[PDB]
Design a protein around this motif. Structure first.
Motif, short mmCIF file in Angstrom:
data_model
loop_
_atom_site.label_atom_id
_atom_site.label_comp_id
_atom_site.label_asym_id
_atom_site.label_seq_id
_atom_site.Cartn_x
_atom_site.Cartn_y
_atom_site.Cartn_z
N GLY A 81 0.85 -1.19 0.00
CA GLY A 81 0.00 0.00 0.00
C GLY A 81 0.88 1.24 0.00
O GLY A 81 1.86 1.30 0.75
N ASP A 94 11.29 1.49 -6.08
CA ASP A 94 12.56 2.20 -6.11
C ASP A 94 13.12 2.31 -4.73
O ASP A 94 12.52 3.01 -3.89
CB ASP A 94 12.32 3.59 -6.74
CG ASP A 94 13.55 4.43 -6.98
OD1 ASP A 94 14.64 4.07 -6.48
OD2 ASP A 94 13.45 5.43 -7.73
N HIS A 97 13.62 5.49 -2.67
CA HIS A 97 12.51 6.00 -1.85
C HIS A 97 12.11 4.95 -0.75
O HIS A 97 10.99 4.98 -0.23
CB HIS A 97 11.29 6.36 -2.72
CG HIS A 97 11.52 7.59 -3.54
ND1 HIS A 97 11.74 7.52 -4.90
CD2 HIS A 97 11.54 8.88 -3.15
CE1 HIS A 97 11.91 8.79 -5.29
NE2 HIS A 97 11.80 9.63 -4.28
N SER A 117 -1.20 -3.69 4.70
CA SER A 117 -0.90 -2.78 3.59
C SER A 117 -1.93 -1.67 3.43
O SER A 117 -1.57 -0.56 3.02
CB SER A 117 -0.79 -3.57 2.29
OG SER A 117 0.42 -4.31 2.31
O1 LIG Z 1 8.94 0.98 1.01
C1 LIG Z 1 8.44 2.08 0.82
C2 LIG Z 1 7.68 2.67 1.95
C3 LIG Z 1 7.05 1.76 2.81
C4 LIG Z 1 6.37 2.22 3.95
C5 LIG Z 1 5.76 1.24 4.91
C6 LIG Z 1 4.82 0.28 4.26
N1 LIG Z 1 4.22 0.68 3.18
N2 LIG Z 1 3.36 -0.14 2.57
C7 LIG Z 1 3.04 -1.44 2.97
O2 LIG Z 1 2.23 -2.15 2.37
C8 LIG Z 1 3.70 -1.91 4.20
C9 LIG Z 1 3.44 -3.21 4.71
C10 LIG Z 1 4.09 -3.63 5.88
C11 LIG Z 1 4.95 -2.78 6.57
C12 LIG Z 1 5.20 -1.49 6.08
C13 LIG Z 1 4.59 -1.07 4.88
C14 LIG Z 1 6.27 3.60 4.20
C15 LIG Z 1 6.88 4.53 3.34
C16 LIG Z 1 7.61 4.05 2.23
F1 LIG Z 1 8.26 4.93 1.44
N3 LIG Z 1 8.57 2.77 -0.39
C17 LIG Z 1 7.65 3.84 -0.89
C18 LIG Z 1 6.97 3.51 -2.21
N4 LIG Z 1 7.91 2.91 -3.19
C19 LIG Z 1 8.34 3.53 -4.36
O3 LIG Z 1 9.24 3.12 -5.08
C20 LIG Z 1 7.64 4.79 -4.72
C21 LIG Z 1 7.38 5.12 -6.17
C22 LIG Z 1 8.39 5.91 -5.38
C23 LIG Z 1 8.63 1.74 -2.65
C24 LIG Z 1 9.44 2.15 -1.42
#
Ligand SMILES: O=C(c1cc(Cc2n[nH]c(=O)c3ccccc23)ccc1F)N1CCN(C(=O)C2CC2)CC1
Ligand SMILES: [Zn+2]
Length: 210
Positions: A81, A94, A97, A117
């Motif tokens: 998510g 990416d 990020h 998520s």
């Molecule tokens: O990994 C993260 C991220 C994850 C989170 C936590 C999270 N985000 N989403 C999840 O489904 C989740 C599930 C279990 C534990 C944590 C999560 C918060 C901010 C973030 F920037 N990114 C942000 C979105 N991503 C990208 O490449 C975006 C396009 C620029 C991938 C990298």
């Protein structure tokens, strides 16, 4: 160029995605603050993300991880998510990020529980909810999440916070497992964007419990 291919609800591929999404919903410690209060989703549509360039980067890394893990790439289907779902489906995940604030440091985070998520679809802790009503528990606005192929390779088990910049030596991913005093639900972390492919784009609503 990304192409979105609609899946028919009568297709067994659509049914498998919805079944994993619905069956992995759980009650969260925050009593529904981040993601809302619900026992089921209303699945609006499921589209397959088709992008030759992204697929080649994914498959190329999958071969490399397979060679480093005694011929097992250890792929898992997991949810993600993010308010930046449009950028992900066009350019892929990416690590530049990666989630600085995460318990395992600057990696890309996934959950095996769709409801975990759903807590991130509108931002960290659900941000301020849907753009229209500013409601983290909105039952009206269509949300979107990804169900991704993730190359885990040799996974590094952890229970507690361990801030890392990359997978540990000889490993390709980090898995935070539940424990009485720690995590309620698992989290899967990769440190390279090419270790995940955003396979399915799910459009859905959370449903108000009856
Ligand atoms: O990994 C993260 C991220 C994850 C989170 C936590 C999270 N985000 N989403 C999840 O489904 C989740 C599930 C279990 C534990 C944590 C999560 C918060 C901010 C973030 F920037 N990114 C942000 C979105 N991503 C990208 O490449 C975006 C396009 C620029 C991938 C990298
Ligand atoms: Zn709304």
């Amino acid at each position: 160029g990304t192409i979105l291919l609609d899946l028919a609800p009568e297709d067994k591929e659509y049914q498998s995605v919805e079944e994993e999404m619905q069956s992995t919903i759980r009650e969260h410690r925050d009593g529904g603050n981040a993601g809302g209060i619900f026992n089921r989703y209303n699945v609006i549509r499921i589209q397959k993300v088709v992008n030759k360039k992204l697929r080649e980067r994914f498959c190329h890394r999958q071969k490399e991880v397979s060679e480093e893990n005694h011929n097992h790439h250890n792929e898992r289907m997991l949810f993600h998510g993010s308010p930046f779902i449009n950028a992900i489906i066009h350019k892929g995940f990416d690590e530049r990020h990666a989630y600085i604030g995460g318990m395992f440091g600057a990696g890309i985070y996934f959950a095996e529980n769709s409801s975990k998520s759903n807590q991130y679809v509108y931002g960290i802790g659900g941000g301020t909810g849907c753009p229209t009503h500013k409601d983290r528990s909105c039952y009206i606005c269509h949300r979107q999440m990804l169900f991704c192929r993730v190359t885990l390779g040799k996974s590094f088990l952890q229970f507690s916070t361990m801030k890392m910049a990359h997978a540990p030596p000889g490993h390709h991913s980090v898995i935070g497992r539940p424990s009485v005093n720690g995590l309620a639900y698992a989290e899967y972390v990769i440190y390279r964007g090419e270790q995940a492919y955003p396979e399915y784009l799910i459009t859905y609503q959370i449903m108000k419990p009856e």
